[PDB]
Design a protein around this ligand. Structure first.
Ligand SMILES: Nc1ncnc2c1ncn2[C@@H]1O[C@H](COP(=O)(O)OP(=O)(O)OP(=O)(O)O)C[C@H]1O
Ligand SMILES: Nc1ncnc2c1ncn2[C@@H]1O[C@H](COP(=O)(O)OP(=O)(O)OP(=O)(O)O)C[C@H]1O
Ligand SMILES: [Mg+2]
Ligand SMILES: [Mg+2]
Ligand SMILES: [Zn+2]
Ligand SMILES: [Zn+2]
Lengths: 348, 356
DNA sequence: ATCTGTACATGTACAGAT
DNA sequence: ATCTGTACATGTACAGAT
DNA sequence: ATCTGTACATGTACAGAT
DNA sequence: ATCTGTACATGTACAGAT
């Protein structure tokens, strides 16, 4: 009962979706035209919608959209960045950009910013640049506030880099045919825009499988009929929404949680889904015991500082080098507290 | 156990398969290239391997291969022939490599098939490697059949197909009812792939005889056979085995064995058993209703179903539900009760015909 | 110089053979 | 159990054509 | 090459049936 | 409370026309 009521509060309304998307769409098509039908260095970018709104796991409001402008770049060679798994140098139209992420992102940002100054019918400005975002973020003021991430991404049709060979362990869940087919799809590089003052940081790209994650969200069952009109609904996404909400509520209260994000929850539940592949283990009637085991799994990830990237298994999202242990135990205690006390944080 | 041992006799041999496939591929590759050359009306034709060998349900010996030479034919058409569901006249809107086969807008299937056959025949004379001749045309068949004596005997049906990328003809709207078994996402995708038209090629002396085409879904059937489960891992290296293909195999063998002894069964063929089992797989969707341990009862329920189809004279085409392959107009009830008894005998007597 | 239809290159599920 | 040969999807190099 | 058109899956919303 | 059925909405893939 309780979790249900939370999910109805989390539900987006058809009317807010209609108005939010029609304005987002207007802006994104225009920015896409400016890239192509003007003789630019990104002539030929294609649009690919990603993220939780397009996975149907967006909660609360339709106020955050994610769009990837992807560009095919042929026979480009990669080189792994100090055995990290996820970050790569790109070596060999793109002349005026080793292919530089910061240089290529900067012009991309310029073009979008020029085009946004010429918007006159929608209240839209470009958010200030951020450290660690490959994105140009647009703040749109409908009556309401909507943010849009325009992600720049290179697209390579070659086979996936060696670090992902162990990745994507869907063989017991979605299957070897699905895996092999997914691995025939392209793979994508986005800017690692870190400002860490470290090393190759300006020339570093990050792998991106947002297109694979989108498929999996939309094809998440062991039975092909999971959540279709002639099958049984499951509660896999409803658990992801509840765990995203718990993290969102926590992050609002405790800035000591600034270094956590929804992709940690996303990653953790890809692992749970592979641990519990049967659709019956995610029966709607077990929603409470399913949330519960997901919190437990997330608490074992915090406690052991181990959250491997579902596609790059040697890339630990919970390594000391990314998040301090105090932050993890901070989060453990809040999680433990909410869990044993029937989630008071949900009731506000 | 009894049924396991049959399956072991039915299994093909990798040694036979290598020798068959090498020869067959050499020929098919050479006829496809010849299609490509010159001002051939069939330049652009494209190969597509179909049938039980490429579905991994070919039994006994690898002695029969089916290959589509398929040709994309843009520009719309299609006039359903007398509400039969399955048969169509092809019309053209522009006035073209297929200029020669037209009869004012209408594409002559037999004229197309005649030229196809002459070209295949001309290119067969010039093969000097392997013993391969072109079998005499059989009525009601879109195929050009190669008999190969790679020492042993091997058939290869070259089927001429037109390929249309449009949405499927409306007589399939209610067909392919996989929603509860393979699901709607699958159905929509499958219905987005092209559909194919092959020459009917009957010499019945009915109107439009030489201009009638028949629908073909062999590409959809191949997907279905290699993707037959509710669970995505059915029969994969990290999932549970089933016995769906094993039942079809046992069904096909009973029919083949019977069809050898008794010529009363000429009007029956493996598409009949194949069709009946697509219905069975839709009736029993779950992988657990096809557990390998239950092979006997699965084969049993499939037989009883087939017998009811025979006896009530109803075997609806899986893709064109208004097309009844067992309608009186296709097979005499005499033939249908002859098969009912022969099946009933085998079933009540521990399948003697398997021991042959 | 450039382009491209054809054929090779690469990867893996399936299923038989050990 | 592991090993292996065929089929098939997709990427890519190239001799020959523009 | 760009763009529209078509079909349908995934949603929300709600009324009536269990 | 849950389930089924219809209406209303957006996203998406691709054929065919420009
Ligand atoms: N740290 C990261 N490493 C790799 N990929 C990431 C990372 N953060 C985000 N992504 C990718 O970018 C996608 C969009 O990011 P983001 O908007 O933050 O998340 P989301 O999944 O849309 O969740 P919300 O529901 O909006 O919180 C999701 C994922 O494919
Ligand atoms: N009467 C028919 N109506 C529609 N499609 C047919 C018909 N007969 C055959 N086909 C199609 O052509 C394919 C090849 O037929 P055929 O060679 O007789 O059987 P098969 O499936 O190859 O099995 P076997 O070779 O007999 O083991 C199977 C099916 O997709
Ligand atoms: Mg989002
Ligand atoms: Mg065959
Ligand atoms: Zn589901
Ligand atoms: Zn199976």
């Amino acid at each position: 009962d309780k979790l249900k009521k939370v999910l109805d509060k989390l539900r987006l309304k058809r009317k807010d979706i209609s108005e939010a998307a029609e304005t987002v769409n207007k802006v994104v098509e225009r920015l896409l035209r400016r890239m192509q039908k003007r003789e630019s260095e990104f002539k030929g970018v294609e649009q690919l919608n990603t993220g939780s709104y397009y996975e149907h796991v967006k909660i609360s409001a339709p106020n955050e959209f994610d769009v990837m402008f992807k560009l095919e770049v042929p026979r480009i060679e990669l080189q792994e960045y100090y055995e990290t798994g996820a970050f790569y140098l790109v070596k060999f139209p793109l002349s005026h950009f080793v292919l530089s992420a910061t240089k290529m992102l900067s012009k991309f940002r310029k073009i979008i910013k020029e085009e946004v100054k010429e918007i006159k019918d929608i209240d839209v400005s470009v958010e200030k640049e951020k450290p660690g975002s490959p994105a140009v973020t647009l703040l749109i003021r409908n009556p309401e506030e909507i943010s849009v991430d325009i992600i720049l991404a290179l697209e390579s049709k070659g086979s996936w880099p060696i670090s992902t060979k162990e990745g994507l362990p869907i063989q017991g869940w979605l299957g070897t045919k699905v895996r092999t087919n997914l691995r025939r799809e392209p793979f994508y590089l986005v800017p690692k825009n870190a400002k860490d003052g470290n090393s190759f940081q300006g020339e570093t790209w990050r792998l991106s499988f947002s297109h694979t994650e989108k498929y999996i969200l939309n094809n998440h069952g062991i039975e092909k009929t999971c959540c279709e009109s002639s099958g049984a609904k499951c509660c896999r996404k409803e658990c992801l929404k509840l765990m995203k909400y718990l993290l969102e509520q926590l992050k609002k209260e405790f800035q000591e949680l600034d270094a956590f994000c929804s992709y940690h929850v996303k990653t953790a539940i890809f692992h749970m889904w592979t641990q519990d592949p049967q659709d019956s283990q995610w029966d709607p009637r077990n929603l409470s015991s399913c949330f519960d085991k997901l919190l437990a799994f997330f608490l074992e990830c915090l406690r052991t500082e181990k959250l491997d990237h579902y596609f790059i298994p040697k890339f630990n999202l919970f390594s000391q080098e990314l998040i301090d242990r105090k932050s993890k135990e901070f989060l453990s205690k809040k999680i433990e507290y909410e869990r044993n006390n029937g989630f008071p944080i949900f009731d506000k």
